[PDB]
């Protein structure tokens, strides 16, 4: 039931084509300095590590950013597993905080791509090991993007039957943002 909305500027792009460009400019978060490192923030919480929205900016002083929305949970130390369900995934640039500090959540100033009703799930089990907790679709695909790697997300999407090779122009589940 997933659909996609794209800026008219990325009509010649595909899901893979775009995400590879976004990730390479977002960069691997671990290779970044602690100086400029952004580990993302949760909002709609009462919580430091859960909320309805998760937004994170590039850790290499680049404009790229990402916003996930749904039922999101972070397990923190020692496993640090991102689990729950992502309904809406959005990519763009210039992450900006909403009026009311981080607590009001953040927004992207330039929206490129938006996945809707993606149904990106993942469970966490405290009794189980880290390795197996990291196999969840949600964690391994989002963590991959955080490490500037679009590949895990791309095979999760392909497993969902979503075409990641066709340009947004001719992709049936994708429509263009009115400019």
The least distance separating ligand HEM from the CB of residue 179, rounded to whole angstroms, comes to: 32
Dihedral pair phi/psi, residue 138, rounded to 5°: -60, -50
The least distance separating ligand HEM from the CB of residue 168, rounded to whole angstroms, comes to: 25
Residue 108 or 146 having the CB closest to ligand HEM: 146
C-alpha 43/C-alpha 51 separation (Å) is: 5
Tokens of 166: 């066709």
The least distance separating ligand HEM from the CB of residue 49, rounded to whole angstroms, comes to: 6
The least distance separating ligand HEM from the CB of residue 176, rounded to whole angstroms, comes to: 29
3-state class (DSSP) for residue 101: coil
For residue 34, cis peptide bond before it (omega within 30 degrees of 0): no
R_g (Cα) of the chain, nearest Å:
16
Residue 89 or 146 having the CB closest to ligand HEM: 146
Q: Which residues bind ligand HEM (CB under 6 A)?
A: 39-42, 74, 78, 80, 82, 139, 142-143, 146
Residue 6 or 22 having the CB closest to ligand HEM: 22
Cα angle, residue 132 at apex, residues 72 and 26 outer, rounded to 5°: 55
Residue 74 or 120 having the CB closest to ligand HEM: 74
CB atoms within 10 A of CB 9: 13
Q: Which residue is nearest to ligand HEM (CB)?
A: 82
CA end-to-end distance (rounded Å), the chain? 25
Residue 40 or 148 having the CB closest to ligand HEM: 40
């Amino acid at each position: 039931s997933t659909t996609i909305q794209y800026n008219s500027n990325y009509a010649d792009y595909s899901i893979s084509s775009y995400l590879r460009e976004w990730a390479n400019n977002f960069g691997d978060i671990d290779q970044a300095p602690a100086e400029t490192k952004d580990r993302g923030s949760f909002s709609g919480s009462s919580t430091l590590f859960s909320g309805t929205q998760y937004a994170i900016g590039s850790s290499h002083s680049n404009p790229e950013g990402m916003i996930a929305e749904g039922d999101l949970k972070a397990s923190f130390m020692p496993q640090h597993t991102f689990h729950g369900q992502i309904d809406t995934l959005q990519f763009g640039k210039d992450l900006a905080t909403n009026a009311g500090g981080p607590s009001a959540g953040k927004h992207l100033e330039k929206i490129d791509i938006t996945f809707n009703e993606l149904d990106l799930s993942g469970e966490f089990d405290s009794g189980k090991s880290m390795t197996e907790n990291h196999q969840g679709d949600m964690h391994k695909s989002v963590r991959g993007l955080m490490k500037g790697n679009p590949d895990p997300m791309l095979e999760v999407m392909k497993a969902k039957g979503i075409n990641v090779d066709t340009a947004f122009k001719d992709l049936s589940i994708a429509s263009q943002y009115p400019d």
